[PDB]
Amino acid sequence: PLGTPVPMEKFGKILAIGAYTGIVEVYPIAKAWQEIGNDVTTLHVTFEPMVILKEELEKAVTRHIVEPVPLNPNQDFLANMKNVSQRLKEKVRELLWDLVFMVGPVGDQKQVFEVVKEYGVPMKVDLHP
Amino acid sequence: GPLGTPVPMEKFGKILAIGAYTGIVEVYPIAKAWQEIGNDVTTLHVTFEPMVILKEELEKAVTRHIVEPVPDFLANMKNVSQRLKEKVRELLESEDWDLVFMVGPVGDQKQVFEVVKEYGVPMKVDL
Amino acid sequence: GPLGTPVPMEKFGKILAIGAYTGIVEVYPIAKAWQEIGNDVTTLHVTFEPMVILKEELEKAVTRHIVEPVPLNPNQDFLANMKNVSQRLKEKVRELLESEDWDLVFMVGPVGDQKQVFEVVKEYGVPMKVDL
Amino acid sequence: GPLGTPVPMEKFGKILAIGAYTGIVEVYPIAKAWQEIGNDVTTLHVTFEPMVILKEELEKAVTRHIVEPVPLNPNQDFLANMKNVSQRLKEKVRELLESEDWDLVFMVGPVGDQKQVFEVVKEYGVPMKVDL
Amino acid sequence: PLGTPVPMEKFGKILAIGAYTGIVEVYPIAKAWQEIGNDVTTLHVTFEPMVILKEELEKAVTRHIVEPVPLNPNQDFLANMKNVSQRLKEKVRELLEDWDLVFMVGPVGDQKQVFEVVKEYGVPMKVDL
Amino acid sequence: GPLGTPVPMEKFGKILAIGAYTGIVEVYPIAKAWQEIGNDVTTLHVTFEPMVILKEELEKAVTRHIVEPVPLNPNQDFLANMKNVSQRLKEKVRELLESEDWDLVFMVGPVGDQKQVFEVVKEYGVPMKVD
């Protein structure tokens, strides 16, 4: 099982999105795209106590945005995941590019896809072969 | 648009549907379907204690649903990882399986794959 | 070895699962699953009269199971007989589409009949998906 | 729209192009081409007696075209009649792989049947490809 | 590791394009398509001293066009290629009679340049793999 | 539209990025990236003498860049000339896979040559991804 195989081309301005643990797999990809000549900005949207690699890719890409959401021990997890789904859709909307990549749970990908859909900019989803 | 992991609907036999963290959400319908088609699937959700979800749902959808809740975020992940390896090992160790499907972070699949591989059991990851 | 057509398990909505000839065997479990997940699938089996199979099985698995048996005319070569199944089957999908709305059309059958069924469904914007 | 099984055009050598039921239609052009490119392909059509088709066409397109017509008993459920085709298929494929050598084998038919043949083929260390 | 797997159907008039060594892999494909009933015309665009299989596919398809470009040894290869990349777009535009399917096997770069030109005429094109 | 070979960005370790003829153009960025991510990649360009390209570029992008230029012989024609490149390919690949260990080998070139190199890499048990 390998990370999402992706093409190494100069797409231009790229928005590398990483939901939850997905940011780990996006780090190297974003890093590479930047090194090849792309102006990529990564976005990590997870729970407050789960932010990771913030420093690493902050030095690897042009701009690294972290949107930490409070892990509410009150409501149930399904509710909490719905907040991330919210923050996630919001951010991507204001941010709006030549390409947008993302690796997170299918549910959040579809949600972000419906967004990016309204602006023509192509998107790439994760793939583990 | 993007869709869940496309998977074949056949009678593989005994299947271990593994879901790490949020991945369990995507596995629920798949497991549910496989069970409905005639498979004897057992789902395994390995996440952090305050993140268990759909426990009730698939508990009624499959034959057996195992939840392994785990109490910086880096060492925390290695725990979820160890428990995931440990747990999966015992499964393949205390009974036979036909197919092992998992959806979760690549790192975790790369490791889970290693253990399952040791038993000659075919695996399928979220493609 | 070769596995059945890998397909996503999502709630597409109303799905038309088409099975030409022996293809219906492979579609049975798929349709069954989609229905179980929350889809309103209707299967369509178009084969020769003496080849209808699994009629009872998926009749209980999905909301509606349509069987369109076409006679194997003994006074005609298989090429003709064959072209007849294509015909009927094409009249059926068109009849289905132009009478009810759908979200997805999945069909597993001979490449020949797939290109035909598609020539129609594309006329209604409904997305289609075949085997692999 | 839907296209036939995309396949590479190389000189594999001796190829056994298998077509079960209506699948032979899709294999005809493929076999024809492989032969034209320099391959020594032999096609095998295993269907029901009253369903043999294109026999003359590919008989002129490839080196050897084998037709194995199975009796279609309209008085048995199709599940039975299908077993026969299955059996015959495993028989002839075994009989062929037992006698002569082969560099490649390609098939296009029901998934269930592709599994059966495959398991046999894999016994004689010869690579195989199936439709997609 | 096999040649580009391609469908054997009667698309109609097909333009089989082969850049540089790519023509070797296209030869059998074109040959086959023609044999199946297609009216394919192959195009080989390479450097003058690299034309190959000219006679072979000249007999296999309806029309085989060879566009040889000179090799200037007083500049880097990136430049010489540009000429080849120019002849490509200049020839594909010319041929764009009425076609049903265009197929090409050659350096990715040119595959994109030929794509923009063809995309213009709403003609289906398939690359290699 | 058409894009370069999509490839995973992981730390495989020591990687041999092979580029035959014009294929080296497409491999350059891939190798460059893999190196940047933490891989110890060595690129190999095997083409005709008057076709070497990007030599300077990836020489600075990866740990080691090997160029094996094969002279043209206007007598053998372009048939035995290519097969003359398939020779250098197999041989160099054989020296590398034999004098060193590699975690993965990647190549982008004419399928014909991809098969050759493959039959060679299979012998030494090394994974290999194609374009």
Side-chain angles (χ1 to χ4, degrees):
Chain A
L2 304 176
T4 304
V6 73
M8 288 291 124
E9 303 198 318
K10 295 191 178 186
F11 299 80
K13 195 185 302 300
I14 309 173
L15 173 60
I17 305 182
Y20 306 101
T21 54
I23 194 66
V24 176
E25 179 178 358
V26 65
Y27 169 50
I29 297 170
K31 185 168 183 176
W33 276 332
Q34 184 78 205
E35 179 56 41
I36 252 57
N38 290 288
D39 175 33
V40 56
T41 76
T42 57
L43 170 59
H44 183 197
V45 181
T46 182
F47 286 122
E48 294 184 357
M50 326 220 313
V51 51
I52 189 57
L53 264 54
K54 178 184 180 183
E55 223 63 13
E56 278 66 16
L57 74 203
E58 255 185 309
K59 178 192 175 189
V61 302
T62 139
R63 180 169 69 258
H64 172 59
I65 304 169
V66 180
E67 287 291 302
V69 298
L71 165 81
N72 200 345
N74 190 69
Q75 48 189 177
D76 84 328
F77 198 61
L78 176 283
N80 256 285
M81 279 186 54
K82 199 160 281 60
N83 294 311
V84 187
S85 291
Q86 292 293 42
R87 184 93 68 187
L88 183 55
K89 278 191 160 184
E90 299 173 301
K91 246 306 181 302
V92 177
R93 279 193 166 292
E94 70 186 60
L95 296 173
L96 286 45
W97 298 84
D98 300 289
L99 186 273
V100 31
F101 172 89
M102 184 195 158
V103 39
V106 177
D108 289 311
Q109 313 200 68
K110 290 202 299 179
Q111 297 287 286
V112 174
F113 170 70
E114 286 297 304
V115 181
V116 181
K117 180 201 291 183
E118 295 305 308
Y119 309 71
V121 46
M123 174 178 99
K124 265 275 295 179
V125 172
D126 70 63
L127 232 73
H128 311 163
Chain B
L3 307 174
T5 304
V7 74
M9 286 295 126
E10 303 197 317
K11 294 191 178 187
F12 299 80
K14 196 185 302 299
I15 310 172
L16 172 61
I18 303 182
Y21 305 102
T22 56
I24 194 66
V25 176
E26 180 177 357
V27 65
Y28 168 51
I30 298 170
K32 185 170 184 176
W34 276 331
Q35 183 80 206
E36 178 58 39
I37 251 57
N39 290 285
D40 174 34
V41 56
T42 75
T43 58
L44 169 60
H45 184 197
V46 181
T47 182
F48 286 122
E49 295 184 356
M51 325 217 319
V52 49
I53 189 57
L54 264 53
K55 179 183 177 183
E56 224 63 15
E57 279 65 16
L58 73 203
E59 255 185 309
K60 178 193 175 187
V62 301
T63 139
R64 180 169 69 258
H65 172 59
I66 302 171
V67 180
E68 287 291 303
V70 189
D72 65 320
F73 190 52
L74 197 296
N76 254 293
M77 295 185 69
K78 259 53 172 300
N79 307 309
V80 186
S81 293
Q82 266 304 307
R83 171 96 68 179
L84 196 41
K85 311 173 77 168
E86 303 168 309
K87 196 61 188 183
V88 170
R89 173 167 286 298
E90 292 303 311
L91 277 316
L92 302 139
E93 214 153 61
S94 83
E95 53 184 287
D96 315 310
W97 306 88
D98 291 280
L99 184 276
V100 46
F101 166 81
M102 185 185 145
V103 42
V106 188
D108 288 341
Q109 313 181 315
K110 294 166 80 66
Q111 301 187 58
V112 173
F113 167 90
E114 286 307 324
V115 187
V116 56
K117 188 187 62 62
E118 195 168 7
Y119 300 62
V121 172
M123 196 171 165
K124 217 288 183 176
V125 163
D126 62 302
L127 264 81
Chain C
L3 304 174
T5 305
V7 75
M9 290 289 121
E10 303 198 318
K11 295 191 178 187
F12 299 80
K14 197 185 301 300
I15 309 173
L16 172 60
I18 304 181
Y21 305 102
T22 54
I24 194 66
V25 175
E26 179 176 357
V27 64
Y28 168 51
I30 297 169
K32 185 170 184 176
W34 277 332
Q35 183 80 204
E36 178 57 41
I37 252 56
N39 290 286
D40 174 33
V41 56
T42 76
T43 57
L44 169 61
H45 185 198
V46 181
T47 182
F48 286 124
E49 295 186 355
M51 325 218 315
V52 50
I53 189 56
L54 263 54
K55 178 183 179 184
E56 223 64 13
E57 279 65 16
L58 72 204
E59 255 184 309
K60 179 193 175 189
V62 302
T63 139
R64 181 190 343 123
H65 172 60
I66 302 170
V67 181
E68 287 290 302
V70 190
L72 240 186
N73 185 181
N75 354 305
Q76 238 179 172
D77 44 289
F78 190 67
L79 199 242
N81 270 157
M82 191 164 98
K83 297 301 176 192
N84 297 189
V85 161
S86 299
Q87 275 293 73
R88 187 80 75 76
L89 167 52
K90 211 165 181 184
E91 307 177 301
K92 243 290 170 282
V93 187
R94 185 150 49 220
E95 160 169 338
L96 284 165
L97 281 51
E98 212 148 56
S99 193
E100 188 180 4
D101 200 73
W102 307 83
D103 295 303
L104 174 80
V105 51
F106 172 80
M107 183 198 144
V108 42
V111 71
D113 297 308
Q114 301 198 307
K115 296 191 297 181
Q116 301 212 57
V117 164
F118 177 89
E119 287 303 308
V120 171
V121 63
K122 67 166 187 172
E123 193 75 5
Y124 304 62
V126 181
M128 183 169 105
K129 211 274 179 55
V130 291
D131 58 320
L132 71 92
Chain D
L3 306 175
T5 305
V7 74
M9 288 292 123
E10 303 198 318
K11 294 191 178 187
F12 299 80
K14 196 186 301 300
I15 309 173
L16 173 60
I18 304 181
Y21 305 101
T22 56
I24 193 65
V25 176
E26 182 178 356
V27 64
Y28 169 49
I30 297 171
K32 185 170 183 177
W34 277 330
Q35 183 79 206
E36 178 57 41
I37 253 56
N39 290 286
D40 175 33
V41 57
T42 77
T43 58
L44 169 60
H45 184 196
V46 181
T47 183
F48 286 123
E49 295 184 355
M51 324 219 315
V52 49
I53 188 57
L54 264 53
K55 178 183 180 182
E56 224 62 14
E57 279 65 15
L58 73 203
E59 255 186 308
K60 179 192 175 188
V62 302
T63 137
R64 180 170 69 259
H65 172 61
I66 303 172
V67 181
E68 287 292 302
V70 165
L72 179 264
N73 180 178
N75 316 128
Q76 301 191 64
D77 72 314
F78 196 46
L79 176 47
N81 288 308
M82 274 181 97
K83 182 67 182 184
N84 310 317
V85 179
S86 302
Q87 260 297 316
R88 183 62 70 82
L89 203 47
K90 296 193 69 172
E91 265 172 41
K92 233 304 182 306
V93 165
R94 162 86 67 203
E95 189 210 19
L96 254 37
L97 264 54
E98 278 277 29
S99 170
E100 37 200 291
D101 70 315
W102 305 90
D103 285 304
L104 161 66
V105 53
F106 172 67
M107 183 170 144
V108 49
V111 63
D113 281 298
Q114 300 196 299
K115 284 192 177 194
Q116 284 195 53
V117 166
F118 183 103
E119 284 305 326
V120 173
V121 182
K122 202 172 59 179
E123 173 59 8
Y124 302 77
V126 39
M128 188 174 133
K129 195 294 178 67
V130 167
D131 63 304
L132 291 110
Chain E
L2 302 175
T4 304
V6 75
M8 291 287 119
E9 303 198 319
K10 295 191 177 187
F11 299 79
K13 196 185 301 300
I14 308 172
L15 173 60
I17 304 181
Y20 305 101
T21 53
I23 193 65
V24 175
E25 180 178 358
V26 65
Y27 168 51
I29 297 171
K31 185 169 183 177
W33 277 330
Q34 183 81 204
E35 177 57 41
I36 253 55
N38 290 287
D39 174 34
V40 56
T41 76
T42 58
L43 170 60
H44 183 196
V45 182
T46 182
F47 286 122
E48 294 183 356
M50 325 218 316
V51 50
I52 189 57
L53 263 54
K54 178 183 179 184
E55 223 63 14
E56 279 65 16
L57 73 203
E58 255 186 310
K59 179 193 175 187
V61 301
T62 140
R63 180 168 69 259
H64 173 59
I65 302 171
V66 181
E67 287 292 301
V69 182
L71 244 190
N72 180 190
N74 304 351
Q75 65 176 188
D76 66 339
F77 211 68
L78 183 89
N80 299 298
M81 286 189 72
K82 290 201 170 181
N83 291 335
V84 175
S85 296
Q86 274 309 304
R87 233 49 52 197
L88 257 312
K89 280 150 55 182
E90 272 172 39
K91 256 295 178 183
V92 172
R93 227 185 294 273
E94 295 188 332
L95 282 66
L96 269 289
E97 296 84 295
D98 208 5
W99 307 72
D100 305 303
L101 185 277
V102 49
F103 168 96
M104 173 195 201
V105 45
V108 167
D110 295 302
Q111 274 184 177
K112 294 191 289 182
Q113 280 192 55
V114 177
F115 181 57
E116 300 313 301
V117 177
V118 183
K119 187 219 284 182
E120 200 81 9
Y121 309 102
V123 178
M125 183 184 128
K126 187 166 180 179
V127 284
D128 85 318
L129 40 128
Chain F
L3 306 177
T5 305
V7 74
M9 287 294 125
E10 303 198 318
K11 294 191 178 186
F12 299 79
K14 196 185 301 300
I15 309 172
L16 173 60
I18 304 182
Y21 306 102
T22 55
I24 194 65
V25 176
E26 180 178 357
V27 65
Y28 169 50
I30 298 171
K32 184 170 183 175
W34 276 332
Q35 183 80 204
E36 177 57 41
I37 251 57
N39 289 286
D40 174 33
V41 57
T42 76
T43 56
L44 168 61
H45 185 195
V46 182
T47 181
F48 286 121
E49 295 185 356
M51 326 218 316
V52 50
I53 189 58
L54 263 54
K55 179 184 178 184
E56 223 63 15
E57 279 66 15
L58 73 203
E59 255 185 309
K60 178 192 175 189
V62 302
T63 139
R64 180 168 69 257
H65 172 59
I66 303 171
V67 181
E68 287 292 302
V70 185
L72 274 167
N73 192 59
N75 189 335
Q76 302 176 63
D77 184 74
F78 214 73
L79 198 289
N81 254 310
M82 285 186 80
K83 204 63 175 62
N84 202 314
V85 163
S86 310
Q87 279 274 306
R88 197 68 67 73
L89 230 324
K90 299 166 67 189
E91 302 185 316
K92 242 299 176 179
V93 166
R94 187 173 257 76
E95 291 185 308
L96 294 8
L97 280 47
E98 186 159 298
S99 61
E100 311 178 6
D101 317 77
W102 312 71
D103 306 306
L104 171 287
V105 43
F106 176 64
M107 176 182 216
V108 36
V111 284
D113 281 291
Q114 277 169 157
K115 277 172 286 179
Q116 295 251 88
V117 174
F118 180 106
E119 292 300 300
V120 181
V121 184
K122 168 181 61 190
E123 167 173 355
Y124 305 87
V126 170
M128 178 176 132
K129 173 171 175 48
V130 73
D131 75 305

